[PDB]
Design an enzyme around this catalytic site. Sequence first.
Site, PDB file in Angstrom:
ATOM      1  CG  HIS A  85      -2.043  -1.010   1.070  1.00 25.15           C
ATOM      2  ND1 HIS A  85      -2.677  -1.557   2.168  1.00 25.15           N
ATOM      3  CD2 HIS A  85      -2.653  -1.532  -0.018  1.00 25.15           C
ATOM      4  CE1 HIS A  85      -3.613  -2.393   1.761  1.00 25.15           C
ATOM      5  NE2 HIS A  85      -3.632  -2.386   0.440  1.00 25.15           N
ATOM      6  CG  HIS A 148      -3.038  -4.083   6.944  1.00 24.17           C
ATOM      7  ND1 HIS A 148      -4.071  -3.196   7.166  1.00 24.17           N
ATOM      8  CD2 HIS A 148      -2.332  -3.577   5.901  1.00 24.17           C
ATOM      9  CE1 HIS A 148      -3.986  -2.201   6.306  1.00 24.17           C
ATOM     10  NE2 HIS A 148      -2.937  -2.410   5.529  1.00 24.17           N
ATOM     11  CG  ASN A 179      -8.054   0.148   3.443  1.00 23.58           C
ATOM     12  OD1 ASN A 179      -9.088  -0.432   3.120  1.00 23.58           O
ATOM     13  ND2 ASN A 179      -7.018   0.296   2.609  1.00 23.58           N
TER      14      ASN A 179
HETATM   15  C1  LIG Z   1      -2.537   1.071   7.547  1.00 24.52           C
HETATM   16  C2  LIG Z   1      -3.962   0.869   7.249  1.00 24.52           C
HETATM   17  O1  LIG Z   1      -4.793   0.699   8.158  1.00 24.52           O
HETATM   18  S1  LIG Z   1      -4.240   0.869   5.465  1.00 24.52           S
HETATM   19  C3  LIG Z   1      -3.223   2.081   4.637  1.00 24.52           C
HETATM   20  C4  LIG Z   1      -4.046   3.187   4.058  1.00 24.52           C
HETATM   21  C5  LIG Z   1      -4.135   4.334   5.058  1.00 24.52           C
HETATM   22  C6  LIG Z   1      -4.719   3.782   6.347  1.00 24.52           C
HETATM   23  C7  LIG Z   1      -5.022   4.782   7.432  1.00 24.52           C
HETATM   24  C8  LIG Z   1      -6.087   4.079   8.304  1.00 24.52           C
HETATM   25  C9  LIG Z   1      -6.128   4.517   9.616  1.00 24.52           C
HETATM   26  C10 LIG Z   1      -7.371   4.639  10.227  1.00 24.52           C
HETATM   27  C11 LIG Z   1      -7.447   5.082  11.541  1.00 24.52           C
HETATM   28  C12 LIG Z   1      -6.276   5.376  12.230  1.00 24.52           C
HETATM   29  C13 LIG Z   1      -5.033   5.234  11.632  1.00 24.52           C
HETATM   30  C14 LIG Z   1      -4.961   4.796  10.321  1.00 24.52           C
HETATM   31  P1  LIG Z   1      -3.190   3.627   2.496  1.00 24.52           P
HETATM   32  O2  LIG Z   1      -3.692   2.475   1.479  1.00 24.52           O
HETATM   33  O3  LIG Z   1      -3.872   4.973   1.974  1.00 24.52           O
HETATM   34  O4  LIG Z   1      -1.717   3.682   2.618  1.00 24.52           O
HETATM   35 ZN   LIG Z   2      -2.130  -1.212   4.043  1.00 19.74          ZN
HETATM   36 ZN   LIG Z   3      -0.759   1.636   7.322  1.00 16.11          ZN
END
Ligand SMILES: CC(=O)SC[C@@H](CCCCc1ccccc1)P(=O)(O)O
Ligand SMILES: [Zn+2]
Ligand SMILES: [Zn+2]
Length: 230
Positions: A85, A148, A179
């Site tokens: 990601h 994840h 996510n």
């Molecule tokens: C690290 C994750 O949970 S998924 C990574 C996505 C960003 C995730 C941010 C989700 C999040 C929600 C609540 C608190 C901290 C991070 P991206 O595909 O845009 O790099």
């Molecule tokens: Zn991710």
């Molecule tokens: Zn992340």
Amino acid sequence: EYPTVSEIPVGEVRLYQIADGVWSHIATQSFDGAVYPSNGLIVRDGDELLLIDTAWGAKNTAALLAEIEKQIGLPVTRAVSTHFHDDRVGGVDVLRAAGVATYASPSTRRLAEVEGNEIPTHSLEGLSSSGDAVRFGPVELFYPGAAHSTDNLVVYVPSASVLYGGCAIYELSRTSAGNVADADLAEWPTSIERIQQHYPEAQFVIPGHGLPGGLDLLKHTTNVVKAHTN
Ligand SMILES: CC(=O)SC[C@@H](CCCCc1ccccc1)P(=O)(O)O
Ligand SMILES: [Zn+2]
Ligand SMILES: [Zn+2]
């Protein structure tokens, strides 16, 4: 003292020393209408630095390189992305332009390509099966199985007893799965179990986002994932 999301404007990067020769890097970025903090790792590798994960985007990764040059002054020579990601590989082109050799598992490289993301140059062999570990300079890379994402790696620094979980591990205060689009919710508790078995002696545990803790983050993450499953 650990920097928080409100304290770091988008485009700035903070360095936090965890132990001798081990730092986290903290950046912030927009995702679906909100700004989140994100952690990576920096590990002294003799006269060089090993970087674990980008700072989530080209601009942030450039700021990370600048902050490293200002505060540390050793060159980043190799970087490992722990999954495909954008918060992990976004900025790989900046790293490559600055002379950094970029690495990831064959799985991560393939998934990044499909997703249309930046692609680390070099493949990390030896990580294709759940439970696989390989040494990579001053760290051990471990594939715990799908969590994840299906490709997610964790990183252990044996000299410092620091375990970097990336996005497979949640910070203590976080009660809500993020996510989970490419997640395997059924496998994720089993994968955490592998991490817990392999690194029973970890003193510091760094989640992908938020505040460092101890091995208690592993159980916390399993509880949160299972709740989203029950
Ligand atoms: C690290 C994750 O949970 S998924 C990574 C996505 C960003 C995730 C941010 C989700 C999040 C929600 C609540 C608190 C901290 C991070 P991206 O595909 O845009 O790099
Ligand atoms: Zn991710
Ligand atoms: Zn992340």
